[PDB]
Amino acid sequence: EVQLQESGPGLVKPSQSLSLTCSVIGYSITSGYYWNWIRQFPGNKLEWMGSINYDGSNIYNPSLKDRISITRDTSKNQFFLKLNSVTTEDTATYYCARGGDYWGQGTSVTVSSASTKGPSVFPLAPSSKSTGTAALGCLVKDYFPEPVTVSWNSGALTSGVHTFPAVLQSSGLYSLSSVVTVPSSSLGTQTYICNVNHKPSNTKVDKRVEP
Amino acid sequence: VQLXXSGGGXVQXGXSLXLSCXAXXXXXXXXXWXRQXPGXXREXVXXXXXXXXXXXXXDSXXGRFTXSXDXXXXXXXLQXXXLXXXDXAXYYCXXXXXXXXXXXXXXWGXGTXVTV
Amino acid sequence: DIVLTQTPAIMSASPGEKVTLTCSASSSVSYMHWFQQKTSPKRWIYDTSKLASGVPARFSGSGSGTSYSLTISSMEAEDAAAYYCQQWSSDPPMLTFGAGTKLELKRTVAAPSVFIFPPSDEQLKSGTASVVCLLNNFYPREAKVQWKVDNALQSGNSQESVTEQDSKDSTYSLSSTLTLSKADYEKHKVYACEVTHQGLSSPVTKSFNRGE
Ligand SMILES: CC(=O)N[C@H]1[C@@H](O[C@H](C)[C@H](N)C(=O)O)O[C@H](CO[C@]2(C(=O)O)C[C@H](O)[C@@H](NC(C)=O)[C@H]([C@H](O)[C@H](O)CO)O2)[C@H](O)[C@@H]1O
Numbered sequence: 050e051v052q053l054q055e056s057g058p059g060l061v062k063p064s065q066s067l068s069l070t071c072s073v074i075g076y077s078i079t080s081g082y083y084w085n086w087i088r089q090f091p092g093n094k095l096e097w098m099g100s101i102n103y104d105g106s107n108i109y110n111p112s113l114k115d116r117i118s119i120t121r122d123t124s125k126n127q128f129f130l131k132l133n134s135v136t137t138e139d140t141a142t143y144y145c146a147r148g149g150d151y152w153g154q155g156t157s158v159t160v161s162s163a164s165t166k167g168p169s170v171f172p173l174a175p176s177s178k179s180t181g182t183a184a185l186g187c188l189v190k191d192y193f194p195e196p197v198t199v200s201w202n203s204g205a206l207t208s209g210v211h212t213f214p215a216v217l218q219s220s221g222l223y224s225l226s227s228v229v230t231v232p233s234s235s236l237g238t239q240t241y242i243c244n245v246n247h248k249p250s251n252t253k254v255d256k257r258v259e260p
Numbered sequence: 261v262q263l264x265x266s267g268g269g270x271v272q273x274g275x276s277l278x279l280s281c282x283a284x285x286x287x288x289x290x291x292x293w294x295r296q297x298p299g300x301x302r303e304x305v306x307x308x309x310x311x312x313x314x315x316x317x318x319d320s321x322x323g324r325f326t327x328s329x330d331x332x333x334x335x336x337x338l339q340x341x342x343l344x345x346x347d348x349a350x351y352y353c354x355x356x357x358x359x360x361x362x363x364x365x366x367x368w369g370x371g372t373x374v375t376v
Numbered sequence: 377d378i379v380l381t382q383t384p385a386i387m388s389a390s391p392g393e394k395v396t397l398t399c400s401a402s403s404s405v406s407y408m409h410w411f412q413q414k415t416s417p418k419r420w421i422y423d424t425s426k427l428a429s430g431v432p433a434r435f436s437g438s439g440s441g442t443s444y445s446l447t448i449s450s451m452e453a454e455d456a457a458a459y460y461c462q463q464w465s466s467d468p469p470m471l472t473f474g475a476g477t478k479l480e481l482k483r484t485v486a487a488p489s490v491f492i493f494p495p496s497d498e499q500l501k502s503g504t505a506s507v508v509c510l511l512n513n514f515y516p517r518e519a520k521v522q523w524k525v526d527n528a529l530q531s532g533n534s535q536e537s538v539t540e541q542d543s544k545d546s547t548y549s550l551s552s553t554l555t556l557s558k559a560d561y562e563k564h565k566v567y568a569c570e571v572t573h574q575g576l577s578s579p580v581t582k583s584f585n586r587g588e
Contacts, residue, residue, distance in 0.1 A: 054288070085471065095417070095460060097471035108469050144416060149409065149462065149471075150428070152416040154285045173493040173508055176584070184491040184510055188499070188553075196261065198366045204302075204352070207370040211512070211549045213537040218555075225537065226551050228510050230489070246366060248357070264543040284540060285415060332430075334415055 051076040053145050053153035060194060061135055061160045069130040071145030071153060079103050079123050082148035086119065086130045088141040089155075096141075101128050135160050159194055163221040167252035168192035170245050173226065175260050179233040185258045186228035187243035191220070192250065199227040200244040206231075236260045261367055265353050268372035271343055279338040281353035281369055287311070290356040291329060291336035292365065295349040295374070302352065308336055309361060320346070340374075348376045378403050380461050380474035388482040388516065395448040397477045399439070399461035408444035409462040410437060413476075417460065421446060456481045456541075483546040487575030488514035492568075492582035495561065505561035509569035509582065511550040513542075520572035521552040526564045530554060562586070 057069035071084070078084055083100040090096070099119040100108040109117050116133035132139065140160050146152045173186035189197055199212045212227035227243060237260070245254040262284040271277055281291065292307035306327040307316045315327045321340075328337035336353060350371045357364035379402045389395050399408055410421035419428040421437040424444065436447040448455060461474040488511040495505040509521060517538065523530035533556065539549045552569065568583035 087471075093458065093476060095473035095476075097473070100471075110470065150419045150422070152418070154287050155416055169499070169502065171496045171499045171506070174496065176492065177588070182489065184489075184512065186493070186508075186510070188496075188506060188508065190499075190504075190506065200368065204368055207368075211539055213539055213549070213551050216535045216537050216553075218535070224535075224553070226508055226553070228491075228512070228549075228551070230512060248364070248366070262540070262543075282543070284543075332418075 051147050051151040053147065053151055055143060055145050055153045055156040057156060057158070059156065059158050061139075061158060063136055063160055063162055064134050067130075067132045067135050067139065067158055067160070069143055069145075069156060069158075071128050071130075073126045073128070073147070076147070077123075078121060078126055078128055083108070084119075084121070084128050085146050085149070086143060087146055087152075088143045090141045098132075099130070137161060157195075161193065161221060163193040165249050166191065166193050166222065167247055167250035168197060168245060168254070170243070170254040170256050172243075172256050172258040173228065174258060175236055179236065181233045182230050183233040183236055184228060184230050185241055186226055187245065187256055187258060188224075188226050189245050190224040191218075191222045192224075192247055193222050194249055195223055197223075197225070198246045199225075200246075201227070201229055202240070202242055203244060206241070261355075263353050263355070263367060263369035265351065265369045265372040267338075268351060268374045270375045273343060273345060273376055275343055277340040277343060277374060279340065279351055279353075279372060279374075280335055281337075282333070282335045283355070286329075286334050286336075286355060287331040288359055290361055292354050292356060292363070293327065293336075293338050294352045294354060295347070296352065297349045300349075305351070306338060307356075313361075343374075343376045345376045347374065349374060377468045377470050378405065378463055378465055378472050380463060380472055382459075382461060382474040382477045384477060385475070386478045386480065386517075388480050389451045390482045391451060391453055393451050395451045395455075395479060397446040397459055397479075399444045399446070399474055401442045401444070401463065404441050405444070405463050407463075408437075408439055409464075410446050411460045411462060411473075412457050413460070414457045420459070451479075453481055455479060480541055481546050483515050485575045486513055486515045486547055488512055488519065488550070488571060488573050488580075490569065490571045490580050490582050492584055494567070494584055494586070500558050500561075503558050505556045505558050507554040507556075507567055507569075509552040509554075509571070511552075511571060511573075513545065513547040513549060514573055514575065515547045516574065517541075517548045518574065519550060521550070522570045522572075523552070523554045524566075524568045524570060525554075526566050527568075 086098040118131040121128040171188040175185045209230040215223040215225040265281040267279040290309040293305040296302040308327040326339040353369040354365040357366040411417040412420040425437040434449040491510040493508040
């Protein structure tokens with residue numbers, strides 16, 4: 050019935066403003082229901098932020114009322130979200146919803162002072178003791194922003210591959226590893242190369258992981 | 261973000277196969293299907309864009325295959341009819357990271373074996 | 377204002393079992409709603425017991441006052457998701473969500489295969505040493521990783537990462553990265569990772585000396 054789609058910048062400097070827009074199709078926002086903005090922190094915790102009604106009235110979370118604003122444009126059938134003086138604690142995936150029965154796809158917004166940086170890629174060489182099953186991988190350390198993609202042997206190796214979710218280090222950069230378990234009999238004959246691809250820095254790294 | 265393809269197997273010439281791939285939101289991104297013979301390169305098979313932007317198919321699979329997508333299940337589909345021995349390959353699924361359909365195929369799947 | 381406490385946090389269930397999720401409220405609640413999420417959160421149960429669109433009849437909602445429940449008569453593999461209870465209040469206007477109960481598909485116990493990786497020479501040329509401990513394909517997820525350098529327990533200098541439940545074999549994989557400077561790294565010799573999991577009779581330790 051009702052369709053919703055968020056749109057807006059995914060990177061905001063701290064102490065500045067984040068602005069998002071929800072485009073509604075198939076239902077007039079002036080017809081009924083509350084139109085809310087609901088975000089989800091990386092911990093999967095949901096927090097309802099604000100609301101604008103069909104008659105234009107606003108309702109805000111008391112924890113954000115000093116820096117939130119929910120407006121609307123009935124001609125374009127849109128309603129907007131403005132969060133002032135945001136912090137790194139505001140990093141979440143923001144959803145727009147009609148009264149809680151129709152949700153958008155969600156937009157990932159990250160708040161950080163870090164600048165764009167390409168990652169350093171290091172080989173996780175297989176150890177000297179390998180029966181059996183051996184393990185090797187690559188370390189993708191120190192980059193910003195998310196995300197980064199990792200393939201093995203240009204995509205020819207998908208079984209036994211595990212690329213872990215990135216972790217935000219204390220420095221403000223992301224770091225991850227991608228491991229793959231292979232037979233120990235292949236370490237001498239089969240070549241293993243990891244392909245790391247980070248679009249915001251336009252970097253592509255192919256590192257051979259040697260025994 | 262991760263992809264997992266399913267639905268392949270072994271089948272004789274002339275019969276069918278329905279492939280599927282689930283994503284770990286893809287409603288705004290196009291999902292393409294690619295296949296690769298053991299001694300060949302990955303060739304384009306089909307692509308399902310966003311709902312209303314229709315679908316597109318390669319010359320090899322026109323009229324025989326049908327691509328679909330379920331936004332609610334975050335999954336794409338590929339129905340295959342009148343299968344030939346030439347269609348025998350490993351089939352992969354990828355997401356076009358560019359919403360403008362330029363084909364920044366960044367995310368790929370594990371793959372699925374198809375043999376005729 | 378109103379705090380929702382969902383119990384249990386994680387719920388492992390096999391196909392065919394009866395699952396009951398509880399949502400307790402600090403103050404009385406007129407109506408409790410439930411949301412499924414695997415993906416945008418889908419409305420699953422509204423007005424305590426009304427089923428939303430696309431909900432099989434095996435689901436059921438109930439409760440009142442300060443305790444509400446969600447019941448699945450015979451759980452299926454497609455029911456594996458996170459379930460949040462939601463409440464709306466008027467006099468102090470607030471729309472509160474619960475922390476969510478994670479319903480996962482249960483499989484057999486698999487002990488993790490552990491691996492240790494010393495810092496590469498390429499990383500040492502940048503003044504940083506990262507030691508990675510790999511825990512592969514284990515179920516259930518509950519585990520423990522300890523870093524012991526020169527037989528000394530480490531704390532505050534390791535970051536852990538876990539994958540989602542795998543789509544094929546329904547297992548987990550975990551990585552623990554110990555981060556040091558090359559100065560601190562070169563001042564010790566024995567680097568060990570000690571792993572604890574319910575499929576292991578005794579802890580599994582992977583060690584290495586620096587210059588080997
Ligand atoms: C058809 C249907 O499913 N209706 C449900 C819907 O009611 C609408 C408004 C109905 N068409 C109408 O009366 O016009 O939602 C209500 C729940 O109502 C409230 C509530 O009191 O819980 C109303 C309240 O104003 C809402 N608050 C906000 C900020 O949106 C909440 C809220 O939407 C929900 O708690 C979900 O977040 O809902 C009821 O479920 C009807 O069955």
